[PDB]
């Protein structure tokens, strides 16, 4: 039947079959409902697309073509919801946001 | 005959070429993206597993994934994630 993939059926770029296999072997439940991997892959693809678009915008404002961990750190830390989602996450080589307290400035 | 290890690099690159079809990504940023995807997968799967356990059910359905997404993500983020998941599931079911 030509073996069309489940990700192409769902209109997704993330692997629905690999997500289903990881759900099966991850010791999460006895069974997986066969629409759970599709939903999950869609959510993961949406989050990845949002972070990648914000990081690419930060790279564009930095006049850069290639996304580095600094751009990812800037994208996550400059957003309320993303920073709350990754509040306890340390990004290697991401640095910190530029922030000096107003009392420290001269005069 | 070293083992093969899998990652989300090609899918992250596909998403990046969809949202920014000129921008590249470094290998360190790809490792960061892989860690982010694995962490979010583990969080959502663990929450869905606990949700299915609390209700005496032995199957993790899309409803458990949707409730876990609503619990774990913040507000607008969870709303758009729920919309994307519902659209993906509806398009998948309407196929074939």
């Amino acid at each position, epitope marked *: 039947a030509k073996a069309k993939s489940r990700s192409s059926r769902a209109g997704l770029q993330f692997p629905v079959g690999r997500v289903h296999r990881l759900l099966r072997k991850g010791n999460y439940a006895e069974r997986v409902g066969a629409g759970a991997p599709v939903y999950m892959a869609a959510v993961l693809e949406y989050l990845t697309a949002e972070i990648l678009e*914000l990081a690419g915008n930060a790279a564009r404002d930095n006049k850069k073509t290639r996304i580095i961990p600094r751009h990812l750190q800037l994208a996550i830390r*400059n*957003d309320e919801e993303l920073n709350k989602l990754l509040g306890k996450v340390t990004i290697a080589q991401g640095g910190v946001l530029p922030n000096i307290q107003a009392v420290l400035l001269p005069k | 005959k070293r083992s093969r290890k899998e990652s989300y690099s090609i899918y992250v690159y596909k998403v990046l070429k969809q949202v920014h079809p000129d921008t590249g990504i470094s290998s360190k940023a790809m490792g960061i993206m892989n860690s982010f995807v694995n962490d979010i997968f583990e969080r959502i799967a663990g929450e869905a597993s606990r949700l299915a356990h609390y209700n005496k059910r032995s199957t993790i359905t899309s409803r458990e994934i949707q409730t876990a997404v609503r619990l774990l993500l*913040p*507000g*607008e*983020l969870a709303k*758009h994630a729920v*919309s994307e998941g519902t659209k993906a599931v509806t398009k998948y079911t309407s196929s074939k």
Partner: single-chain antibody
Amino acid sequence: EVQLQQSGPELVEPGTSVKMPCKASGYTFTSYTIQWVKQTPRQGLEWIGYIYPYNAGTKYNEKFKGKATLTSDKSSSTVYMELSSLTSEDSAVYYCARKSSRLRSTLDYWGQGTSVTVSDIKMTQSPSSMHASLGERVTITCKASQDIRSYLSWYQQKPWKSPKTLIYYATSLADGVPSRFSGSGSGQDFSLTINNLESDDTATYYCLQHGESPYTFGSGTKLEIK
């Protein structure tokens, strides 16, 4: 639940500056940017700028750079707009709306809009005004100068009223909008379809793109019923 209170009308002499507040309630204040838009009868709506109260990060339109200044007050949950060196061409209605920091979200809730009277990418809507009776199909087009991935919203505005969000992301229905309205298209071609007309459908319909740095509105299309 969500509302954006605004001040009364301003009758201002030229050469001065004006504060307009955008006191907000019903939602977490720091998690949503506040957008400021100006509307005139001559040239419709222009996106003035926005401010993000989470880090106080602002971004203004190029033509409005310097003329308008946005400030935040997290204690009172208020956003203030400074218009400096007012001329006679600035007598217009200034609306403030809420927009999430998500790229897909659009300007969903709008304020009353203060009427101040002093003593890129091009959106093109094909039908300037359409005449329709109670029960036919309605279609409007929003051809775009450049490519915007699906970052187009459709708004409806009654006379002397703030605009209402109908469609966001070029297909999704806004919160509380009926399923009668529909959006379609992508890239540079977008369309809004109204299924069957009510008496309340008489209004002006605008299309806004937020896929690039200066947000641009359409020319707007007038619709009336019988």
